[PDB]
Amino acid sequence: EDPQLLVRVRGGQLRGIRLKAPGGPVSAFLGIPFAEPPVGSRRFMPPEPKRPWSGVLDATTFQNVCYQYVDTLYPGFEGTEMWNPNRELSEDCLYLNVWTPYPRPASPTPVLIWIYGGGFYSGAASLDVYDGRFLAQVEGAVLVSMNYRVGTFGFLALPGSREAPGNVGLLDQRLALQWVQENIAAFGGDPMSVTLFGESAGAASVGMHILSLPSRSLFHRAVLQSGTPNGPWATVSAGEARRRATLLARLVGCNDTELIACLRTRPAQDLVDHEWHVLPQESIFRFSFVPVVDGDFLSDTPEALINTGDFQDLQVLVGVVKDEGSYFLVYGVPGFSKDNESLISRAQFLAGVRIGVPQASDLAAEAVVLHYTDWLHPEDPTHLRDAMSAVVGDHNVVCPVAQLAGRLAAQGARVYAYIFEHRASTLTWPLWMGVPHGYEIEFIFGLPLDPSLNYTTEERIFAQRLMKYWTNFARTGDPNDPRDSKSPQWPPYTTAAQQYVSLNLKPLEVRRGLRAQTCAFWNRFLPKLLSAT
Amino acid sequence: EGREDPQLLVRVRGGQLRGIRLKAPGGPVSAFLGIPFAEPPVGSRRFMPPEPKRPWSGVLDATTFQNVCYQYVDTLYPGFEGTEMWNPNRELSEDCLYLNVWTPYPRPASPTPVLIWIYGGGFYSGAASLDVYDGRFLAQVEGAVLVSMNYRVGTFGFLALPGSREAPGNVGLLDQRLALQWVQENIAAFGGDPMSVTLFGESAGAASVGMHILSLPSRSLFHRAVLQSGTPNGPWATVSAGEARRRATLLARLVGCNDTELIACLRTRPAQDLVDHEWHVLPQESIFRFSFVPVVDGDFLSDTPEALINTGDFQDLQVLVGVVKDEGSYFLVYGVPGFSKDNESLISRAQFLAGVRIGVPQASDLAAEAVVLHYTDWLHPEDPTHLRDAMSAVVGDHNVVCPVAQLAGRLAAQGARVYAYIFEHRASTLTWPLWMGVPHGYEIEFIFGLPLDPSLNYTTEERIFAQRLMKYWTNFARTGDPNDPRDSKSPQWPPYTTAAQQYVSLNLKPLEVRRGLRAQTCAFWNRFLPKLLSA
Ligand SMILES: O=C(COc1ccc(Cl)cc1Cl)Nc1ccc(CN2CCCCC2)cc1
Ligand SMILES: O=C(COc1ccc(Cl)cc1Cl)Nc1ccc(CN2CCCCC2)cc1
Ligand SMILES: *[C@@H]1O[C@H](CO)[C@@H](O)[C@H](O)[C@H]1NC(C)=O
Ligand SMILES: *[C@@H]1O[C@H](CO)[C@@H](O)[C@H](O)[C@H]1NC(C)=O
Ligand SMILES: *[C@@H]1O[C@H](CO)[C@@H](O)[C@H](O)[C@H]1NC(C)=O
């Protein structure tokens, strides 16, 4: 029996499986329990450490996916399906996955920990795009990913109550990080060099761990892909979370203790049935149960915390894809569809703005329309369509990212920023969506290295470059190859020069200012506007 | 009579005139200067509408410029040419309603298209007798009949106690209208065609031309109009009835004064006493603000210019409108701390923020914030060169470029034929510093063709350029189209339309067609800012 597949952690023995990567084998250990199944009276409660087990626990397969809403917009279309659960749903879902080189690392290896996105309402560490074997095989990394509770199960909160304190889904992530500290050395991983990375809601989780003191002793560097703790969707106020929780309890037929108790008796799918019914306005890029400003996990709003934090010893890599907003238009904005070029009228554009910026007053919405209209072609359908995408991307991702990068840089952090501009040759969404939210992931994880995936040879070469930036950053806090000259170099993002790089098929190009003019509108003017109005 | 030049004697409705034979570079022209067109608006007539001049006897000598209307004289840079060239070059007087005529020599034997010039100077200053308004070159080279008139400015022209008989306001505009009527009646005696009259003017002169378009009684006195760097809409060209009354009673109080009693007391004040308090009645510390300007009286102006342009019918109107490259730079040295003609005026962020409040004096804190956010360069938010230029652009865009863009857009959409330009050439002889670029008012010397005078020290290219511009203006006056029908080879000047927003660059190089009159920024000024103000 393969001793490379046998490992002992604090809770007992594990049997892993030998997997094939194109360049060689890797050792994978999938479905490792890191917490007691958060079921029955455990629902909505913070996780508890997993009890020791007897014998050898079989970690050769992905465990269940946390209970969550499942997308049905385009039934059986690869573009949407690729994000849907690829295992059985269950509230018993608190398991993590570890990939390492085979044989396992001779000396302690830097650890990358992935945190998936999915708007805090969905996602799983088992998706094909999160496959860790490429990074493990090629860069000899130790890769870890966890499941964390999403939707009402992970983030339903009655702020101040003992039984539904909020943010338990982020506590799930934190326990997994504690697990890595306690156990990763047994896999050949270095607990003294841990890099968090995640995309969308995953990036925002990474950011919340930056901003939450108890998480800080569990990682050394961070990567935020297309997401931030700050911004309009990633957090809610205690007042608003309380509101949403008691509205959901009203819809399902339900003193905080009494209320939470009746919710605990509800079958999972009954809660999920009403997930989308509690949002205050018709919107897109807005999610019902997300992290809450509790005054505990988050001592203040992420805006306040990034504005005042001390980020001296801290390295961060942050970025965005070319078209953050395009994907979301087809999920609520009339006139948009994956099946046509979605050329919209001016009317549709104004209507669209109230949906993409749901919190906006008439006057603020007016300001947005007037800023994004191309007044040389105010009525041009192509311009109006692309502008609609840009409003959503900018408001939700690009400008929150520019704001974080800027505050981090000014307050002592080492920051590297990018924009990702390559569109996959295999993409099944329309051309008008360009490079949509989430389609850089498969390249960072190295999927193009698999011949059967039908990526182009240039895309393979490109994925390898990306894997190097990311693992080199994990190793050192600097994505630049250490013994390679001529590139040119990826420079740190600073407040003075605001340098970032474009990631694409051509060599790194250095640009200055991350939508500087347009993000000043979003981050400097709009707040002053709604502040009074 | 008897031994006079028979080509310099002419009769008009009021009597006989003797003009003078003037030398221009390419030959002689006839000038008739200092023709009275109204009764001297003096004494009991101060503040009153002008009365047509009563016939005189004998031959009136029309060989020299008459008095300049009483006005505030600029003392910012004593003895500096850049400021002096705009100051009164004849004695100041309330007896000042005279006009000038230039024609070819001998006078045209067939009826010639007429150009009428209205000077600017913020409605507080100006004179038709300044060097840069010399009609001799357009007369000689293009064969134009050129008229320019003096009109009352400042308090004498524009002090209004709206609703009163004795000071109804806008009398300076009524002066201009009277001259226009004079041209309709008398210009044929000079060989001018009264059925082809084109108005043109710059800054407040342009705003004036715009008021005549918007005021029905003037409409039958002209056929085409040119507005150079000014418009009747916008933030400086008019004041409400309420604001005019407020400024008038403050000034009265400042000199020690029922509207009849008040106006009567003002009529007893020395002209200079009124002028001395001109700038003391503006509501905020400002630049590109003038104390006494046309008022929305519900008479001359039946409503605000904004409402009138937005909703009027201009089907059979032909207009040429444009701006210079740096409308705002000139004004900064008259009020924005940190700006001088003697240094590079590299300012700090703080000076920019203070400057914006002065250059956009009617803006709330939030509106000001909006302005500062829009014009700030966020890659170089503290860079002094950028901030200097942005300050200039704030003032220029707010006061001229966007009101012009707004005017052109409404006129085009409402059936007018519109031609738009940006004038980008800086005179080789300009005495203002380089940082000011092509400042407000410095296209005028080219339109009038001063560079044709060798003694002025312009370049050969400037001479050729000036000739081109004279051709455009006179071609437009003649046909309502600045293009030469006998010259297809040269690039064409297309009309400005809402759909294509075309205009041309005027500089040393051939005509270049461009799209969008500062479209993105002007949307801010023209569409957003008003909506903000309604909140
Ligand atoms: O945002 C939405 C909208 O969700 C819904 C709202 C209401 C209803 Cl009834 C129904 C629905 Cl579905 N869907 C969405 C957005 C992005 C992705 C892709 N993204 C997933 C995680 C990794 C990064 C890429 C998938 C679904
Ligand atoms: O705007 C001003 C301000 O004037 C003043 C304000 C206050 C005081 Cl105390 C004192 C003063 Cl002076 N002056 C100004 C602007 C432009 C020109 C040039 N312009 C004149 C008309 C034709 C086109 C060019 C001359 C003076
Ligand atoms: C595109 O298709 C969708 C769904 O079929 C439709 O609702 C929309 O109106 C279409 N858009 C255009 C511009 O035809
Ligand atoms: C330019 O000079 C004037 C007076 O000489 C001064 O008041 C002003 O502050 C100077 N500006 C700068 C930017 O140095
Ligand atoms: C033109 O140039 C000559 C030659 O230097 C000079 O003497 C004359 O004064 C100049 N005239 C003007 C108006 O600058």
- Our CA-based measurement puts residue A379 at a distance from the nearest CA of chain B, in whole angstroms, of 10
- Our CA-based measurement puts residue A513 at a distance from the nearest CA of chain B, in whole angstroms, of 6
A498 interface with B at CB cutoff 8 Å: yes
| Dist. CA A425 → ligand 3 center (Å) | 25
CB contact under 8 A, B532 and A363: yes
Closest-CA residue of chain A to B381: A496
In this complex, the residue of A370, A524, A525 whose CB is nearest that of residue B527 is: A370
Q: Which of B77, B334, B345 to mutate to test the pocket of ligand 4 (most atoms within 8 A of CB)?
A: B345
Q: Relative to the alpha carbon of A326, which ligand is closest?
A: 1
In this complex, the residue of A367, A374, A520 whose CB is nearest that of residue B528 is: A367
Ligand 1 lining (C-beta closer than 6 Å): A 71, 73, 83, 117-119, 123, 199-200, 276, 327-328, 331, 437-438
Q: Which 3 state secondary structure label does DSSP give B296?
A: coil
| Dist. CA B133 → ligand 4 center (Å) | 33
Q: Which residue has the tokens 């573009």?
A: A79
CB atoms within 10 A of CB B58: 8
Q: What is the DSSP string of A63-125?
A: -PEES-----SSTT-HHHHTTS-SS-EES---EEEEEEESSPPSS-EEEEEEE--STTT---T
d(CA B323, CA B326): 8
| Residue A392 in tokens | 């959503």
d(CA B213, CA A40): 81
CB atoms within 10 A of CB B391: 28
Q: Which 3 state secondary structure label does DSSP give A9?
A: strand
d(CA A3, CA B443): 89
Q: Which atom of ligand 4 is the closest one to the Cα of B346?
A: 13
- Our CA-based measurement puts residue B410 at a distance from the nearest CA of chain A, in whole angstroms, of 15
Q: Which atom of ligand 5 is the closest one to the Cα of B456?
A: 13
Which run of H or E residues covers position A178? helix A168-183
Q: Which residue has the tokens 């040879």?
A: A457
Q: Which 3 state secondary structure label does DSSP give A517?
A: helix
d(CA B227, CA B212): 11
| Residue A362 in tokens | 């008439």
Closest CA to A507 of A429, A421, A440, A435: A421
Q: Catalytic pick from B329, B440, B443, B445?
A: B440
A-chain residues near B529 (CB < 8 A): none
Closest CA to A245 of A162, A358, A148, A164: A164
Listed as own residue / partner, the contacts of B342-346 with beta carbons closer than 8 Å and 24 or more positions apart are B342/B433, B344/B388, B344/B433, B344/B435, B345/B388, B345/B433, B345/B435, B346/B384, B346/B385, B346/B387, B346/B388
| Dist. CA B369 → ligand 2 center (Å) | 27
Q: Which 3 state secondary structure label does DSSP give A37?
A: coil
Closest CA to B201 of B210, B192, B190, B213: B210
- Quick one: CATH architecture of B1-535? 3-Layer(aba) Sandwich (3.40)
Q: What are phi and psi of A370, to 5 degrees?
A: -75, -25
Ligand 4 lining (C-beta closer than 6 Å): B 338, 340, 342-343, 345-347
Q: Is there a catalytic annotation at residue B327?
A: yes
Q: Catalytic pick from B142, B306, B327, B445?
A: B327
CB contact under 8 A, A370 and B520: no
d(CA B88, CA B73): 7
The letter for the amino acid at A175 is L
Assess contact for A492 and A326: CB atoms under 8 A: no
- Our CA-based measurement puts residue B400 at a distance from the nearest CA of chain A, in whole angstroms, of 19
| Homologous superfamily, domain A1-533 | Alpha/Beta hydrolase fold, catalytic domain (3.40.50.1820)
| Dist. CA A234 → ligand 1 center (Å) | 14
| Pairing outcome for strands A499-503 and A509-512 | antiparallel
d(CA A309, CA B131): 65
Q: What is the DSSP string of B96-118?
A: --EEEEEEESSPPSS-EEEEEEE
3-state SS string for A323-365 = ECCHHHHCCCCCCCCCCCCCCCCHHHHHHHHHHHCCCCCHHHH
A377 interface with B at CB cutoff 8 Å: no
Which residues fall within 8 angstroms of residue B78, CB to CB, at 6 or more apart? Answer: none
Q: Which residue has the tokens 């009228």?
A: A345
Q: What are phi and psi of B427, to 5 degrees?
A: -50, 130
Q: Is there a catalytic annotation at residue A200?
A: yes
Question: Is B431 a pocket residue for ligand 5 (Cβ < 6 Å)?
Answer: no
Closest CA to B326 of B227, B375, B393, B394: B393
Q: Is there a catalytic annotation at residue A395?
A: no
Closest CA to B94 of B44, B133, B128: B44
Q: Which of A73, A74, A331, A340 to mutate to test the pocket of ligand 3 (most atoms within 8 A of CB)?
A: A340
Which residues fall within 8 angstroms of residue A136, CB to CB, at 6 or more apart? Answer: A21, A26, A99, A100, A101, A142, A143
Q: Which atom of ligand 5 is the closest one to the Cα of B429?
A: 14
d(CA A338, CA A430): 6
Ligand 3 lining (C-beta closer than 6 Å): A 335, 337, 339-340, 342-343
Q: Relative to the alpha carbon of A115, which ligand is closest?
A: 1
Method: X-ray
Q: How far is CA A77 from CA A69, A74, A118, A324, B47, in A?
A: 17, 6, 18, 21, 80
Assess contact for A505 and A456: CB atoms under 8 A: no
